[PDB]
DNA sequence: ATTTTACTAACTGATAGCGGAACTTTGGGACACCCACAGGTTACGCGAAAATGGC
């Protein structure tokens, strides 16, 4: 019972942190693009710089 | 008696190994705020076959 409770609490915490981190990343994708716009034509393509 | 040769020991060079310090190399970090791209192009022409549109 105790290990099951600990596992459920840990899984919930990791899921919540992962969701929040995903929200932040999806919000700032546009900042990533704005930064990567300035390093084109240096051997890498635009999408590689974005990733 | 003399000359040629076979045997042996010492020198030397190549080479594998090691030490160690310098040198190259890799991974991490940086906290004012910054938040959607190019990006040249095309005066072809012809025939087929494949994909769309019409009622």
Identify the sign of the CA torsion A34, A38, A41, A43.
Answer: negative
| A7 CB less than 7 Å from any atom of strand B | no
Write the burial class of residue A15 (CB in 10 Å: 0-12 exposed, 13-18 middle, 19+ buried): exposed
CB A49 within 8 A of CB A36: yes
| A21 CB less than 7 Å from any atom of strand B | no
How far does the CA of A37 sit from the C1' of B6, in Å?
A: 87
Report CA dihedral (A30, A27, A23, A29) to the nearest 10 degrees.
10
Protein-proximal nucleotides of chain B (any atom < 7 Å from a CB): 34-38
How far does the CA of A27 sit from the C1' of B32, in Å?
A: 21
């Amino acid at each position: 019972e105790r290990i099951k409770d600990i596992s459920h609490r840990m899984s919930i915490g990791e899921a919540k942190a992962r969701r929040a981190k995903k929200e932040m990343v999806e919000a700032n994708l546009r900042l990533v693009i704005s930064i990567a716009k300035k390093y084109t034509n240096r051997g890498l393509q635009f999408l590689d710089l974005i990733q």
